[PDB]
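Researcher: I'm comparing several assemblies side by side, and this is the next one on my list. It has 275 residues spread over two chains. Same procedure as the others: predict the full complex and return the structure.
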Amino acid sequence: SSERTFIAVKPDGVQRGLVGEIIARFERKGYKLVALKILQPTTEQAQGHYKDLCSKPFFPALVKYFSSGPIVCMVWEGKNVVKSGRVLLGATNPADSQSGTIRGDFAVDVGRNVCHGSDSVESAEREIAFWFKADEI
Amino acid sequence: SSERTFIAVKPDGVQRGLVGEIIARFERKGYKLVALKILQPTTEQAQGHYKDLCSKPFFPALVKYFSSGPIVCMVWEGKNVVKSGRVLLGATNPADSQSGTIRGDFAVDVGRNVCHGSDSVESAEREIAFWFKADEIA
């Protein structure tokens, strides 16, 4: 109903001109866009995104990539939008993703994988609050 | 490659799920997205946008529809982008538009013609300043 999810087109996804493609697939699914913007994330913001990999190898490499160019931030809304989001995006690692999904169709690298989606309603609410102010939504 | 144009998906375009399709056509064309937001315009914004049409009998209906729901605002950057904007969108009146353009493929009505595009560079200048702050154009 009023369930929401966060979708981000990463710098590689924007540079490859995949923004419209991704938006269109959520539109085709019948979902509603209630927040949308473009920004080059700050180092502090990228760190926040990969927050739980803080103590893993080459965490700065990921932060660097994530803030290397503008991304497109989105909030979609509708029944089961979070689950639909991962169905549409496909497996996080393109090696496991199948054809017909975003990563299946366009992604190869597991680091630079074109886009991100919340994996839960839990993570969604956190992610949306981080990138958007309440008035933007 | 610094010239800019202003593109807006009108409320009809948004409801019919045409945002991705329109953005995709500017990406394929090779242009750079440098500004973006989603907003339902106020009465005053719609009026401000169609201000040169304030004395036309169809003005209020135009203001009512343009402010009836969310629109998606866009600035694209590059050589000839204002010209290309017109090329991709097609004639403002869908009855004059060709298949292959946004209006040719998706639009019927003059009022509900899916999307707005700057018709000229200086018009792009005004429209861009009207809808965006300087810190919104990446």
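Model: For your comparison table: Residues 1-138 of chain B form a domain with the Alpha-Beta Plaits fold (CATH 3.30.70.141).
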